[PDB]
Design brief:
The structure is cut from a larger assembly and holds 1 copy of chain A (343 residues), 1 copy of chain B (364 residues) and 2 copies of chain C. Chain A is of the alpha/beta class and 343 residues long. Chain A folds into 3 domains: 142 residues, P-loop containing nucleotide triphosphate hydrolases (Rossmann fold); 98 residues, Zinc Finger, Delta Prime, domain 3; 71 residues, Helicase, Ruva Protein, domain 3 (Orthogonal Bundle). Chain A has a 5-stranded parallel β-sheet with strand order 1-5-2-4-3, with helices on one face. A two-stranded parallel ribbon of chain A has the order 6-7. Chain A is globular and about 75 Å long. In chain B, strand 3, helix 6 and strand 4 form a beta-alpha-beta unit. Chain B has 3 domains: 176 residues, Rossmann fold; 63 residues, Orthogonal Bundle (Helicase, Ruva Protein, domain 3); 119 residues, Up-down Bundle (Zinc Finger, Delta Prime, domain 3), CATH 1.20.272.10. A 5-stranded parallel β-sheet of chain B has the order 2-3-4-1-5, with helices on one face. In chain B, strands 6-7 form a two-stranded parallel ribbon. Chain B contains 17 helices and 7 strands. In chain B, helix 9 runs parallel beside helix 11. In chain C, 17% of the residues lie in helices and 41% in strands. In chain C, helix 1 runs antiparallel to helix 2 and helix 6 packs antiparallel against helix 7. The radius of gyration of chain C is 26 Å and the shape is elongated. Classes of the chains: A alpha/beta (343), B alpha/beta (364), C alpha+beta (369). At the A-B interface, helix 2, helix 8, helix 11 and helix 16 of A face helix 2, helix 6, helix 7, strand 5 and helix 14 of B. The structure holds adenosine-5'-diphosphate, beryllium trifluoride ion, magnesium ion (MG) and zinc ion. Zinc ion binds next to loops of chain B. Chain A binds a DNA/RNA duplex (11 and 20 nucleotides) through helix 10, helix 12 and helix 14. Chain D: Belongs to the beta sliding clamp family. Chain D: Keywords: Cytoplasm, DNA replication, DNA-binding, DNA-directed DNA polymerase, Nucleotidyltransferase, Transferase. Chain D: GO terms for molecular function: 3'-5' exonuclease activity; DNA binding; DNA-directed DNA polymerase activity; identical protein binding; protein homodimerization activity.
Chain lengths: 343, 364, 369, 249
RNA sequence: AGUGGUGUCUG
DNA sequence: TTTTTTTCAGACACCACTGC
């Protein structure tokens, strides 16, 4: 199939419409805008009737097959849509997706929306049979190092003037929150029809919504950015994240750091990285962290992490978020006191 | 004020025009611009904090939508239809307590009411308070209606915890986030309310009430009515302060402040207060431990203060900047030891008192 | 005074309350929409039941002393009291304060009521179509199209039924996106042309109000509401907005081939083919040749039925794919012995109608073959 | 399978007889009560009579029917599930019913098939002491006449605890009900009676079930005072008795 | 109303 | 490239499908 970013989708849609469109990724906003563009282009070429379905173990597949095979009294040119579940094309769903891949026709246009597909796990069969004459659209959230240029492009295409300061403020409050970021730009356009956004204008009309995953917290710890890591920790506290997930995500990299710092006396860090199968972008930040106050924080932090783990897993009142703040501050070149470490 | 003062300040004082709303200027300005320019989204999700006006803003927006003078940011005065929202009932404006009617059947009836024409107003406006409580199937039905809503239907959703709303609902709703009111705004609105109620008030009592409100204007209004209750139709500073102290539960922070300052009589007075309130003592020790731990983390890095403790920011700063880390370490160790030995004491009260006595006796 | 002096037998009150109850009984949107509205006026009792969209009113004659009062009382409790009291018991209900007293021979009840000023009433509207019609004609008009209505479709206009007043005839139209049912009958009177979309609930209640006697069913339609008078029962229902799909366009424009057969044989053949039709991808295939009609379906079992010699045909050999539900419902609604279908093309839709009775016409959009 | 070679009691009983015997007592059982001995029906055998007793500590129901065959006195508690499913399978009154009760399990041969169940270990209470021992007030009424009046009163009854006050005066009976909404229902009925004015407040569902169990035309109620129980039965027989212990509200 | 499932939150 | 969670016990809340 044609693998495509949202940038050229319009162009591809102007070239022609394929049998099936697969909108995949973890970003609600990018998927939604891609689906809207696809539906508008389809309606331009006569696809008037729409449908929606949620791919679920309790869905009625017979209705989908009936509407795909049969035609309607009006608006014969029809389109169909399916929301894939959180996990993806379950093993009980691949066969019926294959049937749909057989039950299609040039009259119908299929839209597939859901999270990213683990291609290493799921491939061929359904995937290749669509790949015959289909389009894959990858709509994933831009990361922190990439978000500012995305926001600049969005401001340019919405006819706004964003300076670097407003851009970084917007990139600060809204991460993993591209939907609310676009809504914030829309609200700022509504607030001032001038279209010129400065620092105070965006600063006043913005909330610290954000959305982080424990990987962001662990990366912030490895870079040793105190404010960034603490902001991430507060955000996962407010979001309601399970602290034990944070514990495991930090523990994996912390034990890797302990192993690397212990073995670095006999082997350069490059061969250790190769031994443990760690990737290059990970390699850079882990090399930055390994020579940043090591051999003391790597056992003191393991001690504090064990304290948090046992306290979390014995009682039911939790109250481990402050201890996680202690960890966030220990691994960022801000030494703590033995009083809180030992307990 | 009213015909015998039974009518509550909270409900009697509710905005009827956009200008009577206290400074939630963001949503008001954006909505006024959208209404005047004709740029209308299908749904207008409102959110924020309790008692900061999201239901008031939604009601005023419904009034502006269905007013016969046209889509205006300023609903007029008489406009019988535009009046029916406040006094009596309006046919086309449906107000649903989504907390009372969470079921997919109760919302099914109204989503089947969607396709019928509005009686008088232009828009079949829906005001769904506490929208986060609809079940999964109620949310599915609401989303299905939000995909292709008719041009005569608008949805107004208000909630306090939007995180429970699905992303599918949030993508179709232009969420307007309301920020917790400042102490100045709350104090000014309370001043205006009391001045127009012909209620004798002292300036300091208003600031005390605003600080005690925790950013919610309705909290300030309820505390104000209660303060008038504690007295005879006058909001006196002494009565308000006594009422606030009676309602006060911030014992651990005051205990840490007085223990670090080495103020034995104040510490014992605060322990007496915590005893008279029937406050758990192990919980008191845990709160003091958490406060000391947070003070230390702030001393390490100013970013350790999250948005969960915006009420007690300044004091924390004052304690973190002025107290060396050695003293905080010693006090944390002392209170940890005391909480460890709390069960084996004459009673919890004496155990907490003795732990605080040790912490004072350290004098480091 | 406060007492809405009221006195009637049970025999003349059980059926009117049973009619007025309607949708009441469950959880209402507003707490008052579970209470029947009782009104006394000019020697008549008015029973009213409202759902904020439907309005059922019953009139009962008063031949005993009465007082002009009105109040709303819980529907289920009042009905349970009314039927609980013995046969021929002269109910005497009066009012005082906020409680109304029900009385019978050697029995008393007290019920909590709400004011009549708060109970909703559907606003008066101007009517453009004043229409009167016999009972059986309306019964057939509804029954011949109710099957083809949408089932909670996302398209509002698909739900409900279309009423068209054209010249001397009234027409009922129903569509679900794949079927079309049209029933047009003369009414003996001239009316202005008008088009109205009636919701599913209104159609169901219209079918419900039908009596086995001879009473002129009076239909009065405005721009946003429909009203039906049947004896002393009055029904008001608001309408569904939008545009109904123009049934004239979906009607096969220029048919050229046609099959003629009977209702019972086709019914049996399609019922037999249904068993060999999978629920997944439900449908049938019709092989049509000269005086030949073979009905099969898609199924892994790969079965077949053949009754080709029971049909008359004069066109070319070709195939059209219907669905089990569509054809079964259409033939069931076509009770006449003879039946015929207009095959135009495999892509185009097919008309089912009687050999000489074209008033009830159905249009089925086939599959893609 | 059948290791219960010896049985304590044996019955060759008509199906209709036990159908009435259970139907006249089933509604008074206890469902998932903490008193495990009350979560069942007591079959009691004495002389030629078999009795079913069911109580939940708020109502007692006893029903006795002759058999003709002399049997030793015995007591057994059949749990709720066993007796309910035996009642369900007890159809086709033409075929007789065989009953085989041992010390630990019960068997019922219905038609051609066999049913097996276990027993409740506890010992059922003595119902003779629950029955009032000095009924000084006796009143009579019509079963349907009384029942319809109770139903009409129960229409406006407290939905949580369906309770009515029954007053007895000279040749007159009064049933008064109210709900938390103060909706008052009052029914007055003509009875034959001789005694003193007395009020007693008891549940409505229990009395209605008692009346439905007695498919008769004349009903006799026996009462002692406002605080003790009421013994309801029919006036055409003494084979079925019911004890309703009132509320103190 | 009985039964079974999903899911979320409290220690 | 992906990479993400202990537990036993209990309390609600909603939504089939049944059964009258
Ligand atoms: N912006 C505001 N202006 C004036 N009063 C307010 C405002 N916000 C809250 N209130 C007061 O609080 C009371 C309840 O407000 P409400 O808007 O219902 O809060 P919520 O957002 O939690 O639904 C109102 O009657 C009003 O007195
Ligand atoms: F009405 Be609010 F959300 F407290
Ligand atoms: Mg609210
Ligand atoms: Zn107005």
């Amino acid at each position: 199939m044609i693998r495509l970013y949202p940038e050229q989708l319009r162009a591809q849609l102007n070239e022609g419409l394929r049998a099936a469109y697969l909108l995949l990724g973890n970003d609600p906003l990018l998927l939604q805008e891609s689906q809207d563009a696809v539906r508008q282009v389809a309606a331009a070429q006569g696809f008037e009737e729409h449908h929606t379905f949620s791919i679920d173990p309790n869905t009625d597949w017979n209705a989908i097959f009936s509407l795909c095979q049969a035609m309607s009294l009006f608006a014969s040119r029809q389109t169909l849509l399916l929301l894939l579940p959180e996990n993806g094309p379950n093993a009980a769903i691949n066969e019926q997706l294959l049937t749909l891949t057989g039950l299609l026709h040039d009259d119908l246009l299929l839209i597939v929306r859901g999270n990213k597909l683990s291609k290493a796990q799921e491939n061929a069969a359904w995937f290749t049979a669509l790949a015959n004459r289909s389009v894959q659209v990858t709509c994933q959230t831009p990361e922190q190092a990439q978000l500012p240029r995305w926001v600049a492009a969005r401001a340019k295409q919405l006819n706004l003037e964003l300076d670097d300061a407003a851009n970084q403020v917007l990139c600060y409050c809204y991460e993993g929150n591209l939907l609310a970021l676009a809504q914030a730009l829309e609200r700022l356009s509504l607030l001032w029809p001038d279209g010129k956004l400065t620092l105070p204008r965006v600063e006043q009309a913005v909330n610290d919504a954000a959305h982080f995953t424990p990987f962001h917290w662990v990366d912030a710890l490895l870079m040793g950015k105190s404010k960034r890591a603490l902001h991430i920790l507060q955000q996962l506290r407010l979001e309601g994240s399970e602290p034990v997930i944070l514990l495991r995500t930090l523990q994996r990299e912390l034990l890797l750091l302990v192993n690397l710092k212990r073995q670095s006396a006999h082997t350069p860090l490059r061969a250790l990285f190769d031994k443990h199968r760690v990737w290059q972008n990970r390699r850079g930040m882990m090399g930055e962290a390994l020579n940043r106050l090591s051999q003391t924080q790597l056992r003191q932090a393991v001690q504090l992490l064990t304290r948090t783990e046992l306290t979390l897993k014995q009682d039911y009142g939790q109250s481990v978020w402050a201890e996680l703040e202690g960890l966030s501050l220990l691994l960022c070149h801000k030494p703590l006191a033995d009083v809180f470490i030992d307990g | 004020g009213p015909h015998m003062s039974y009518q509550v300040l909270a409900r009697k004082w509710r905005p009827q025009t956009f200008a009577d709303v206290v400074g939630q200027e963001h949503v008001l300005t954006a909505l006024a611009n959208g209404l005047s320019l004709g740029r209308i989204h299908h749904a207008y999700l409102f959110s924020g904090t309790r008692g900061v006006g999201k239901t008031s803003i939604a009601r005023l927006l419904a009034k502006g939508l269905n007013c016969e003078t046209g889509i205006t940011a300023t609903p007029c005065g008489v406009c019988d239809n535009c009046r029916e929202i406040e006094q009596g009932r309006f046919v086309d404006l449906i107000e649903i307590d989504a907390a009372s009617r969470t079921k997919v059947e109760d919302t099914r009836d109204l989503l089947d009411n969607v396709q019928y024409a509005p009686a008088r107003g232009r828009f079949k406006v829906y005001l769904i308070d506490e929208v986060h409580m609809l079940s999964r199937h109620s949310f599915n039905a609401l989303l299905k209606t939000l995909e292709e809503p008719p041009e005569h239907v608008k949805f107004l959703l208000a909630t306090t915890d939007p995180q429970k709303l699905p992303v599918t609902i949030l993508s179709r709703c232009l969420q307007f986030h309301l920020k917790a009111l400042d102490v100045e705004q709350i104090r000014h609105q309370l001043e205006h309310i009391l001045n127009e109620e012909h209620i004798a008030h002292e300036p300091r009592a208003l600031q005390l009430l605003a600080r005690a409100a925790e950013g919610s204007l309705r909290d300030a209004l309820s505390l104000t009515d209660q303060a008038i209750a504690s007295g005879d139709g006058q909001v006196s500073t002494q009565a308000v302060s006594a009422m606030l102290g009676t309602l006060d539960d911030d014992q651990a922070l005051s205990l840490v402040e007085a223990m670090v300052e080495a103020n034995g009589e104040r510490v014992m007075a605060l322990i007496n207060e915590a005893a008279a309130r029937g406050i758990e003592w192990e919980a008191l020790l845990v709160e003091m431990l958490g406060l000391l731990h947070r003070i230390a983390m702030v001393q390490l890095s100013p970013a350790a203060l999250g948005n969960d403790m915006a009420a007690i920011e300044l004091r924390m700063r004052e304690l973190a900047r002025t107290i060396p880390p050695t003293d905080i370490q010693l006090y944390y160790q002392t209170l940890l030891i005391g909480r460890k030995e709390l069960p084996y004491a004459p009673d919890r009260r004496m155990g907490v008192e003795m732990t605080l006595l040790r912490a004072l006796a350290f004098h480091p | 005074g406060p007492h809405m002096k009221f006195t009637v037998e049970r025999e003349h009150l059980l059926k009117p309350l049973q009619q007025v109850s309607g949708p009441l009984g469950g959880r209402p949107t507003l707490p008052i929409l579970g209470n029947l509205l009782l009104q006394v006026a000019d020697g008549t009792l008015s029973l009213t039941g409202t759902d904020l969209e439907m309005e059922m009113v019953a009139r009962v004659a008063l031949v005993q002393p009465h007082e002009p009062g009105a109040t709303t009382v819980p529907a289920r409790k009042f009905f349970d009291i009314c039927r609980g009291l013995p046969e021929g018991a002269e109910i005497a209900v009066q009012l005082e304060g906020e409680r109304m007293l029900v009385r019978s021979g050697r029995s008393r009840f007290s019920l909590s009521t709400l004011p009549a000023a708060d109970f909703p009433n559907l606003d008066d509207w101007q009517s453009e179509v004043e229409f009167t019609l016999p009972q059986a004609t309306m019964k057939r008009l509804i029954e011949a199209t109710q099957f083809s209505m949408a089932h909670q479709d996302v398209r509002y206009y698909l739900n409900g039924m279309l009423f068209e007043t054209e010249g001397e005839e009234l027409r009922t139209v129903a569509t679900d996106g794949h079927r079309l049912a049209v029933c047009s009958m003369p009414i003996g009177q001239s009316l202005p042309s008008h088009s109205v979309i009636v919701p599913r609930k209104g159609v169901i209640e219209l079918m419900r109000m039908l009596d086995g006697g001879d009473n002129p069913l009076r239909v009065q339609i405005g721009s946003n509401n429909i009203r039906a008078h049947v004896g002393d029962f009055i029904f008001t229902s608001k309408l569904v907005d939008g545009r109904f799909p123009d049934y004239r366009r979906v009607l096969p424009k220029n048919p050229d081939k046609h099959l003629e057969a009977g209702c019972d044989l086709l019914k049996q053949a399609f019922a037999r083919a249904a068993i060999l039709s999978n629920e997944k991808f439900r449908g049938v295939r019709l092989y049509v040749s000269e005086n030949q009609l073979k009905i099969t379906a898609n199924n892994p079992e790969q079965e077949e039925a053949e009754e080709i010699l029971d049909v008359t045909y004069s066109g070319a050999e070709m195939e059209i794919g219907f669905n089990v539900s569509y054809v079964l419902d259409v033939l069931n609604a076509l009770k006449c012995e003879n039946v015929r279908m207009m095959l135009t093309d495999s892509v185009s839709s097919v008309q089912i109608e009687d050999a000489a009775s074209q008033s009830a016409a159905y249009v089925v959009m086939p599959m893609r073959l």
